[PDB]
């Protein structure tokens, strides 16, 4: 196969040869879950990461594309990326001026964040809990959206898991963002809270402290039918 032979370029200096072998891994990365595993062993996980710290936008834009695909693999596959050193790197991209870089960089993070329990706990320990919370209060809606993926994903498991998001300070963050004239956010925010308020007596009470108690009550009389149902079902859970 041309898996390793293609990776060698990533290390090479020749730009023409590097770039040419910077998109390939991508097209192949998104060739199916089973294919995602082939890329890992191939030795592209680290190679791509190294590109994260590159000036050339064309290079980064690609590095994130290929990395994102692999990040959208299976539970085990995703772990491979976490055990490569792309965690303390991809996150750094979040704090970038370029819109494209931050855009793709976020996608890769969201894809990974959407892992299993053990996988999620790994992200929390890394220290990306608060770092994401701050993003919630950003002007660029594009970044704000993806920012919800991670948070939500993190609170998509056992009660304890959901706690990691509460301790960070998502309770209030969601309560504020909830008050937005945007429909994309009005739903996203809810998707998170609703998930956090789906635990036990300890998890529920934690939500009451937030403030959604109102945002959920007001939604009861919303235009959208689906949103009206989710709000009602979510409210009853609190009571």
Q: What is the DSSP-derived secondary structure letter of residue 140?
A: -
Q: How far is it, in rounded angstroms, from Cα 197 to Cα 200? A: 8
Token readout for 113 is 């964040």
For 215, the token pair is: 């945002």
What letter does residue 85 receive in the DSSP assignment? T
- Give the number of residues written for the chain: 239
| Rg value, the chain, Cα | 20
Dihedral, CA of residue 135, residue 67, residue 56 and residue 58, to nearest 10: -100
Every domain of the chain and the residues it spans: 1-113, 130-239
**Can you say whether the dihedral through the CA atoms of 139, 140, 142, 148 is positive or negative?**
negative
Q: What is the DSSP string of 124-137?
A: HHHT-HHHHHHHHT
C-alpha span between 136 and 151 (Å, rounded): 10
Which of 94, 88, 107 minimizes the C-alpha distance to 29?
107
Cα–Cα distance measured from residue 159 to residue 64, given in angstroms and rounded to the nearest whole number: 32
**What does the buried/exposed string (b/e) look like for 85-99 if buried means 16 or more CB atoms within 10 Å of the residue's CB?**
ebbebbbebbeeeee
Structure tokens at 111: 């894809």
Question: With contact defined as beta carbons under 8 Å apart, do 206 and 166 qualify?
Answer: yes
C-alpha–C-alpha distance, residues 82 and 54, integer Å: 20
> Would you tell me how many other CB atoms lie within 10 Å of the CB of residue 32?
11
What is the Cα–Cα distance from 73 to 77, expressed in whole angstroms? Answer: 5
Architecture of the 1-113 domain: Alpha Horseshoe (1.25)
Q: Determine the Cα–Cα distance for residues 79 and 83; give it in Å rounded to an integer.
A: 6
Residue 211 CB neighbours (<10 A): 17
How far is it, in rounded angstroms, from Cα 158 to Cα 214?
25
Closest CA to 138 of 104, 94, 88: 94
SS3 53: coil
> How many degrees, rounded to 5, is the angle at CA 198 between CA 87 and CA 166?
45
Angle between helices 87-94 and 99-113 (to 10 degrees): 140
Find out whether 235 and 220 touch, Cβ atoms under 8 Å. yes
CATH fold match for the domains 1-113 and 130-239: yes
Torsion 167-169-172-175 (CA) sign? negative
Phi, psi of 162 (to 5 degrees): -60, -25
Separation of alpha carbons 22 and 45, rounded Å: 12
| 3 state DSSP class of 147 | helix
CB-CB contact of 80 with 50 (8 Å):
no
Whose CA is closest to 28, among 46, 54, 2, 50? 2
Domain 130-239 has CATH 1.25.10.10: yes
- Breaks in the chain (C–N beyond 2.5 Å) sit after none
Q: How far is CA 134 from CA 4, 146, 156, in A?
A: 39, 13, 20
φ, ψ dihedrals at 83, nearest 5°: -95, 25
């Amino acid at each position: 196969p041309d898996l390793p032979k293609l990776v060698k370029l990533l290390k090479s200096s020749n730009e023409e040869i590097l770039l040419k072998a910077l998109r390939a891994l991508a097209e192949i990365a998104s060739g199916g879950n089973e294919q995602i595993q082939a890329v890992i062993d191939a030795g592209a996980l680290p190679a791509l990461v190294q590109l994260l710290s590159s000036p050339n936008e064309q290079i980064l834009q690609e590095a994130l594309w290929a990395l994102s695909n692999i990040a959208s693999g299976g539970n085990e596959q995703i772990q491979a990326v976490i055990d490569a050193g792309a965690l303390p790197a991809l996150v750094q991209l979040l704090s970038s001026p370029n819109e494209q870089i931050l855009q793709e960089a976020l996608w890769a993070l969201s894809n990974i964040a959407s892992g299993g329990n053990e996988q999620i706990q790994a992200v929390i320990d890394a220290g990306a809990l608060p770092a994401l919370v701050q993003l919630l209060s950003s002007p660029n809606e594009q970044i704000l959206q993806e920012a919800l993926w991670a948070l939500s994903n993190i609170a998509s498991g056992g009660n304890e898991q959901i706690q990691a998001v509460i301790d960070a300070g998502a309770l209030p963050a969601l309560v504020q963002l909830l008050s937005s004239p945007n429909e994309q956010i009005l739903q996203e925010a809810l998707w998170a809270l609703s998930n956090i308020a789906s635990g036990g007596n300890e998890q529920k009470q934690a939500v009451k402290e937030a403030g959604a108690l109102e945002k959920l009550e007001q939604l009861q009389s919303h235009e959208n039918e689906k949103i009206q149902k989710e709000a009602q079902e979510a409210l009853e859970k609190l009571q």
